[PDB]
Design a protein around this ligand. Structure first.
Ligand SMILES: [K+]
Ligand SMILES: [Mg+2]
Ligand SMILES: [Zn+2]
Lengths: 47, 175, 76, 133, 59, 118
RNA sequence: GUCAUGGAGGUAGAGCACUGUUUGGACUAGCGAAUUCAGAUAAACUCCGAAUGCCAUGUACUUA
RNA sequence: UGGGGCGGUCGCCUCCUAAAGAGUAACGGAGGCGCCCAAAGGUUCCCUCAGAAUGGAUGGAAAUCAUUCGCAGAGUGUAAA
RNA sequence: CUGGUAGUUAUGGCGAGAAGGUCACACCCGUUCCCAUCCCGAACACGGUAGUUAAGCUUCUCUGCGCCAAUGGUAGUUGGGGGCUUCCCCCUGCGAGAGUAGGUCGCUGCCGGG
């Protein structure tokens, strides 16, 4: 496992940290999370 | 169709007379038929499995179901998860059609017909027949067969005792 | 000579934190446990690590549900 | 007499307060040895008593041993100090409380039975008596 | 009854080659033949060996 | 071969449903029974163990009988009207272990259209 | 502090319902696994289970 | 640290000791951890395990199928409770 | 009287023996339709009611199993006092577990129909 930072695709803010397995998920994870700056849900992508 | 009509017309009075049931509902009737292949050689070539699938889907006419292991056996070079057999169930009129085909053009067309062992009942009222060679099928040609996979033909009825099951089974052709 | 033993964990201070018939204020912890050794009753909640807590003000009552089990309730 | 396996290799020594929980009556044979006091009884003592009382009867009749050495005890050699963990197991013992019947015999007359039990009781570290069903 | 998925089987008529025994039952193959027996309907024909009518054990 | 009892497994599912849903005086529960012929509805609170309203596909009037489904809608209409007459306005629907698919769904929707608030 | 009332909690004892250890028969898949009959044993066994101690309530009595 | 040295140990979790609340020592008796999972998380709907007897081709004590008995004798990522 | 739905530590369960009815309930018949099967209208869903109490269901009778359970005695034990201290004894209060006399084939509530 490794540590991961998730970045908002509309602001560039780095709002979330999480983990993943690099062998099972070699791509960049995308999740829809709340963005505190815009105060709405936005797609977040691994840096 | 024809077998069901004949049964409901004759065997119901015949059974209600031969055993003296208080109500007609007590009459033992066929319930369902299960055809199980069984394939313990799947961990080397998986074409045996889907093979068994198509000859089942021809002999019965409907998609079988892949069954997998409930545990792991080192001796049979297995671990849990191997698809290790296929099965089919039959109910209703199509069951009667399969029964008629088996009793006319399949069981008589076997290599020999020395009856059916009357002591093979489970002790409750159900019966099991074991087909050894797959080529005995009417609609299936052995030229497209890779192995003689036997079939468990399980016949289940609502007969409380083996006696009534034997009555019904012998009444319908092959004893 | 050596023992090869000698380790233990810190005690976690489990058990009943309030008494039967005692007046209690909302949010108070009533019981600490592993598993549901005691179940939540009326006006009583179950925490994420199985802690039982009061949701209102009232008096604590330890009670017996069906033969083999227990619960605790809070009544105003 | 040794147990085939044990769950733990070390065990507390325990105590011997009170009268024996069960086994205070003759249940299989006609004659028995009863403990009047409490004592640890090892498997060497059991074996010696059994051989004496069986040899006197010339392999006639039947003998039942009503106690088993379930417990183990440990020890430390000469020259070692205190500490550094528990010692190594040595033998197996049965704690016997007062009132326990520990040997029963059958199949022989009064004289043979009583003399065999007298011969056996001299091999044991506990004070005994002879009882009849 | 899988909607469309299930394989297609049709009512077909079997004809014995020994005593010309005629039977009707479902079959997964129609053998690409035609008959006009069983007035009111038509079913395909199939040529096979002796059926239970001409069986040594059934006779 | 033992024949399964439909009512026993239905009651098992009903207990699973009742693990969460319970009727109070302010918010009574609406329970539904479906037989081979008719459909029944009760409105009940569990605090006192008393039912407060009821309707059935067996009353003398309202004889519209077309495929057991519009009958279910009629029963829902009746039970909603009676519950409103008694002052019941908010309820929790108890499907009684049945799937939310056919007659049950029609009954619930017909009750929704009238003075009931699921 | 005592009295009355209500609780949480598995020790002493006991027991064999689970888990380990274990004796004598009957029967036995094959000298010998299981089933049963009778009889034992336990800090890390429990179908049971105290006395005490503990936490509260009281408007009871006394006391600081 | 039952003189010091040699050997062993040093933080966290679970059981016994621990004397039926909580807490409780010894170079006392036993074991684990320094992670894993993109589902092995959330929710909605559905259902039930181990083993045994019997009946049946390859198949054999045990692989898949059918009936009956079966309160958990299974499972619960991993040590124990 | 019956159908639905609750409460109550199985004294309510398991087992055995019988009676009853399409008023309700169920089995049963069918798959056009909504929906469904890792396959199967078996279940789920829907559309009706020829036959039936064979089963579920309801009612009645059994202590065989299970469950509940005294009284007396005994073990243990707070406090007080002694021995000859692997432990034991005496006085006062509390008081099991096992075993037994005995109990049990349920008891209460609301609603709709006969
Ligand atoms: K002596
Ligand atoms: Mg999980
Ligand atoms: Zn943003």
């Amino acid at each position: 496992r490794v540590n991961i930072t998730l970045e908002c695709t509309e602001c560039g803010d780095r709002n979330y940290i999480t983990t993943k397995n690099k062998r099972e998920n070699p791509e960049r994870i995308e999740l829809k999370k709340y963005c505190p700056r815009l105060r709405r849900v936005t797609l977040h992508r691994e840096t | 169709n024809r077998l069901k009509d004949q049964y409901l017309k004759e065997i119901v009075p015949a059974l209600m007379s031969k055993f003296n049931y208080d109500s007609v509902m007590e009459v033992p009737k066929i319930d369902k038929i299960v055809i199980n292949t069984g394939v313990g050689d799947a961990t080397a070539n998986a074409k045996v499995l889907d093979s068994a699938v198509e000859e089942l889907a021809l002999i019965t006419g409907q998609k079988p179901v892949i069954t997998k292991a409930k545990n792991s056996i080192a001796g049979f070079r297995l671990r849990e998860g191997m698809p290790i057999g296929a099965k089919v169930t039959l109910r209703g009129e199509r069951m009667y059609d399969f029964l008629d085909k088996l009793v006319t053009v399949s069981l008589p067309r076997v290599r020999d017909f020395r009856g059916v062992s009357k002591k093979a009942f489970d002790g409750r009222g159900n019966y099991t027949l074991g087909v050894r060679e797959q080529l005995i099928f009417p609609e299936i040609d052995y030229d497209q067969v890779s192995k003689v996979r036997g079939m468990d033909v399980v016949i289940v009825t609502t007969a409380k005792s083996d006696e009534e099951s034997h009555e019904l089974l012998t009444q319908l052709g092959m004893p | 000579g050596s023992t090869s033993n000698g380790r233990d964990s810190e005690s976690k201070r489990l058990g009943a934190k309030r008494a039967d018939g005692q007046f209690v204020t909302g949010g108070s912890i009533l019981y600490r446990q592993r598993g549901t050794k005691i179940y939540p009753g009326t006006n009583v909640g179950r925490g994420g690590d199985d802690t039982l807590f009061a949701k209102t003000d009232g008096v604590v009552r330890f009670e017996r549900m069906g033969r083999d089990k227990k619960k605790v309730s809070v009544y105003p | 007499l040794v147990p085939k396996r044990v769950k733990y290799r070390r065990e507390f020594r325990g105590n011997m307060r009170g009268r024996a929980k069960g086994g205070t009556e003759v249940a299989f044979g006609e004659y028995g040895l009863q403990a009047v006091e409490a004592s640890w009884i090892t498997n060497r003592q059991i074996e010696a008593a059994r051989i004496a009382m069986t040899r006197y009867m010339k392999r006639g009749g039947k003998v039942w041993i009503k106690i088993f050495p379930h417990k183990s005890y440990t020890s430390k050699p000469i020259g070692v100090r205190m500490g550094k963990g528990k010692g190594a197991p040595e033998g197996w013992v049965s704690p016997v409380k007062r009132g326990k019947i520990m040997f029963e015999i059958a199949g022989v007359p009064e004289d043979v039975a009583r003399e065999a039990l007298r011969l056996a009781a001299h091999k044991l570290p506990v004070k005994t008596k002879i009882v009849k069903r | 009854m899988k909607t469309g998925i299930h394989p297609e089987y049709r009512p077909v008529v079997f004809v014995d080659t020994s005593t010309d025994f005629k039977f009707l039952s479902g079959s997964t193959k129609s053998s690409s033949e035609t008959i006009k027996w069983e007035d009111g309907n038509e079913y395909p024909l199939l040529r096979v060996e002796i059926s239970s009518d001409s069986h040594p054990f059934y006779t | 071969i033992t024949k399964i009892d439909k009512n026993k497994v239905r009651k098992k599912r009903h207990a699973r449903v009742r693990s969460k849903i319970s009727g109070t005086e302010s918010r009574p529960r609406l329970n539904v029974f479906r037989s081979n012929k008719n459909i029944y509805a009760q409105v009940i609170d569990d605090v006192n163990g008393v039912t407060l309203a009821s309707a059935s596909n067996l009353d003398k009037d309202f004889g519209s009988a077309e495929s057991k489904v519009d009958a279910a809608s009629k029963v829902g209409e009746l039970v909603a009207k009676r519950a409103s007459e008694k002052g019941i306005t908010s309820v929790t629907f108890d499907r009684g272990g049945y799937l939310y698919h056919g007659r049950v769904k029609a009954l619930a929707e017909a009750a929704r259209e009238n003075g009931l608030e699921f």
